[PDB]
């Protein structure tokens, strides 16, 4: 048997929902409290799959075909001259995170996934978790799962930690077909590319059309390296005075630096430049990286990038979070010495979770200052570190 | 002749109107930049009149009793068991934000107020200060008074100085005629009246009716401490999930904060309890105070709460801001060795901004820890310190 207990999950996304419906399909009693109005939006951004990201919805007969796009190479690139670093072969698919969000709620449906609920407070017992809601309501469980993301309310609350700026940002932009032109659109397609300049890097790699019949479309991002101060908080300060915590999106972009992002683009090699000129709707989000020393907090869990948050260069954050996730609903599964395989799960979970950091730092230290970042490099390859033992195939 | 040189005024406030009306006065060639969208609004709240505040309207022909409310006593009780503390006689007048601002305003006009304009940034050189706005624009002067407030962008840019919390807010609230019962409207009217606790107090004064024609109002204050993390992120965050720096308005507060209010309020002697109970539209603001060693740096002057950032209990914010920009103007007025005249300025315009920030602090350290409060104590009177010799009634 499952546990008989009462969990709540706070944060609708790719851990809560993760965690929700592994609960659910397992029997166990479960909420989500979304602070979202309406169900979710990634503003068509890309996602790279790893094999946990992708892992529930394939176990529930979702294609991959139909959900993720494929590739045949790995490309480096200077940015600036078009110069050839090297290129590798390669197969990664790539998905959308509407796509995996999309195919989460789905499956989870509305009736116990309640929005409107941001958590503002919490407290604890020996039995329960009160949870408290900006809306003036509250809710009671006997565990709470912290899936509320890098700026996580929960982590705030219990540790005082939130996200630290890593000396960098990163514009987003997405392509549809035509926007550009085809050879444009050739150089890119059915590739992840890396454009790598003296001070920062672009990646661009195909994904899925926004809606099941349309055509694939064109993602990617510029790092800029932009000096904590003045310099970030006028590129975070949205058209209307208010200087924003993680994105300025589009429709909000103070146009000096929708402009600024145009001009320093025209200098890059021009399948690069036109990218960064023809996208319709960039925005801008921090690069900011936080770290916890345990996921288990009495009566509250923190999974996903509310545990530890990391940053996108290894790709593989959406599946840490899976997997986190994935891990904590087997524990209340198997529901045996609930306090003692917490304990074993945070473990694995951390080291998993602090190596990925580990990992995506190094990453930024090449990628962000013209440092060596060699074609095929085993050690700056997509995923999660390995943490278990290897299996057969 | 007073300069010839362009001066740009950023903040459209008190101080920043107060600037820009002494130097259009003067010939002096001067712009007003805002960052809201239309004229502006105090939420209808209590501003007691110092001389340096109502000095530049009296200076134009308007009539005191006009903008203003008498009171012949001042009043100290315990607000729990409404025990006497003791009365003086007094006669403060007492005004409204709106009444401050409106007057300014009208005799500014639109042609050089340009409202929209929140500045984002700002650099300067040997002849000139460019100031880059959250529209994409920018203008140019001679020289720029940060006169944008407690939360002066100007300052953040130059200084990289913000609002510290104190440890403590203070809930606002306005009664009109008939809200509540006769006998509380006359146990406040015509009088200031402190509501002292062990751990925090309640003020209450008459103001004028928000339009000319309407009767007077009562504005009350509660100050509560509330402990930095938790308790004050969950009070400062609005009903949507927003943790707001520095006020939560009626509209948006969680109705938890709300009730909590309320509920608080029910312990309080009658009088106190029925003007927290009765309020239609209380919020909450932080309190928090900053200072600054210069307000000179190089064409960037800082002046009203984007200088020394005042804490309200010595009832002399608006009054220091109005000095500031007065003695300021005159600077630019009087026009002879500039630099100098501005170290001269900004000397005694420290010393004031200095000692008014030491005694609201000795205030609150008394106010808000049941510290012995005395009735008529000089030290504790509203106003600001004698910087200047004494002169002849
Ligand atoms: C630029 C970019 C590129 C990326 N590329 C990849 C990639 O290639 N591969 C990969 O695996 N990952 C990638 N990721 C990482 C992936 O997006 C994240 O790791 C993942 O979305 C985290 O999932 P999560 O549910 O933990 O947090 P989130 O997705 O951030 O969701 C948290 C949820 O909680 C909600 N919430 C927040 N606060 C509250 C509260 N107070 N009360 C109630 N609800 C709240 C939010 O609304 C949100 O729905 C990328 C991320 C970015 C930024
Ligand atoms: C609870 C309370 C009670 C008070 N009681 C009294 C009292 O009894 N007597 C008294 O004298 N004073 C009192 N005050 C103090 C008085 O309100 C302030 O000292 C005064 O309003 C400061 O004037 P200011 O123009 O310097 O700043 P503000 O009034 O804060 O105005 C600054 C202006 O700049 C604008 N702005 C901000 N940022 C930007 C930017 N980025 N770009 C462009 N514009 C910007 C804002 O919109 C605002 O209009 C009280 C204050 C409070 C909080």
């Given at each position: 048997?499952?546990?008989?207990?009462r969990?709540?999950?706070?944060?609708g996304?790719?851990?809560?929902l993760?965690?929700?419906?592994?609960?659910r399909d397992?029997?166990v009693?479960?909420?989500?409290?979304?602070?979202?109005?309406?169900?979710?939006?990634?503003?068509?951004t890309?996602?790279?799959?790893?094999?946990?990201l992708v892992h529930?919805?394939?176990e529930?007969?979702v294609?991959?075909?139909?959900?993720?796009?494929?590739?045949?190479?790995?490309?480096?690139?200077?940015?600036?001259?078009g110069?050839?670093?090297?290129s590798?072969?390669?197969?990664w698919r790539?998905?959308?995170?509407?796509?995996?969000?999309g195919?989460?709620?789905?499956?989870?449906?509305?009736?116990?996934?309640?929005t409107?609920?941001?958590?503002?407070?919490?407290?604890q017992?020996?039995?329960?978790?009160?949870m408290?809601?900006?809306?003036?309501?509250?809710?009671e469980?006997?565990?709470?799962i912290?899936?509320?993301?890098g700026?996580?309310?929960?982590?705030?609350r219990?540790?005082?930690?939130?996200?630290t700026?890593?000396?960098?940002?990163?514009?987003?932009?997405?392509?549809?077909?035509?926007?550009?032109?085809?050879?444009?659109?050739?150089?890119?397609?059915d590739?992840?590319?890396?454009?790598?300049?003296?001070?920062?890097?672009?990646?661009?790699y195909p994904?899925?059309?926004?809606?099941?019949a349309?055509?694939?479309?064109?993602?990617?991002?510029?790092?800029?390296?932009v000096?904590?101060?003045?310099?970030?908080?006028?590129?975070m300060?949205?058209?209307?005075?208010?200087?924003l915590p993680?994105?300025?999106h589009?429709?909000s972009?103070?146009?000096?630096?929708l402009?600024?992002?145009?001009?320093?683009?025209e200098?890059?090699?021009?399948?690069f430049?036109?990218?960064?000129?023809?996208?319709?709707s960039?925005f801008?989000?921090?690069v900011?990286?936080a770290?916890?020393?345990?996921?288990?907090?009495?009566?509250v869990?923190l999974?996903g990038?509310?545990?530890?948050?990391?940053?996108?260069?290894?790709?593989?954050?959406?599946?840490?979070?899976?997997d986190?996730?994935?891990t904590?609903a087997?524990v209340f599964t198997?529901?045996?010495?609930?306090?003692?395989?917490?304990?074993s799960?945070?473990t694995?979970?951390?080291?998993?979770?602090?190596?990925?950091?580990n990992?995506?730092?190094?990453?930024?230290?090449?990628?962000?200052?013209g440092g060596?970042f060699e074609?095929?490099?085993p050690?700056?390859?997509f995923?999660?570190?390995?943490?278990d033992?290897?299996?057969?195939?």
């Open positions: 048997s499952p546990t008989t207990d969990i709540a999950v706070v944060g996304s790719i851990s809560g993760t965690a929700a419906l592994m609960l397992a029997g009693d479960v909420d989500v409290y979304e602070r979202s109005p309406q169900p979710l939006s990634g503003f068509g890309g996602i790279v799959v790893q094999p946990e529930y919805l394939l529930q007969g294609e991959l075909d139909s959900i993720s796009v494929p590739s045949s190479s790995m490309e480096y690139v200077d940015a600036l001259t110069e050839r670093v090297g590798v072969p390669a197969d790539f998905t959308s995170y509407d796509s995996i969000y195919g989460l709620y789905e499956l989870f449906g509305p009736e116990r996934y309640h409107s609920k941001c958590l503002v407070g919490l407290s017992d020996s039995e329960t978790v009160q408290r809601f900006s809306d003036g309501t509250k809710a469980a006997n565990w709470v912290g899936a509320d993301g700026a996580s309310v929960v982590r705030k219990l540790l005082g930690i939130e996200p700026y890593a000396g960098y940002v990163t514009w987003r932009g997405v392509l549809q077909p035509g926007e550009v032109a085809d050879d444009v659109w050739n150089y890119f397609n590739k992840f590319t890396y454009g790598l300049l003296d001070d920062g890097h672009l990646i661009a994904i899925p059309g926004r809606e099941n349309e055509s694939p479309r064109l993602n990617f991002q510029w790092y800029w390296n000096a904590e101060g003045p310099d970030l908080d006028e590129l300060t949205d058209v209307r005075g208010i200087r993680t994105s300025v589009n429709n972009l103070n146009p000096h630096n402009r600024q992002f145009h001009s320093k683009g200098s890059l090699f021009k399948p430049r036109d990218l960064v000129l023809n996208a319709s960039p801008v989000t921090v900011a990286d770290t916890v020393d345990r996921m288990v907090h009495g009566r869990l999974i990038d509310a545990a530890v948050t990391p940053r996108p260069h290894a790709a593989a954050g959406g599946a840490k979070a899976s986190d996730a994935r904590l087997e198997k529901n045996h010495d609930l306090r003692g395989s917490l304990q799960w945070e694995r979970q951390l080291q998993q979770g602090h190596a990925y950091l990992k995506v730092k190094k990453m930024a230290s090449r990628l962000q200052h060596s074609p095929g490099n050690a700056f390859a995923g999660l570190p390995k943490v033992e290897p299996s057969v195939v």
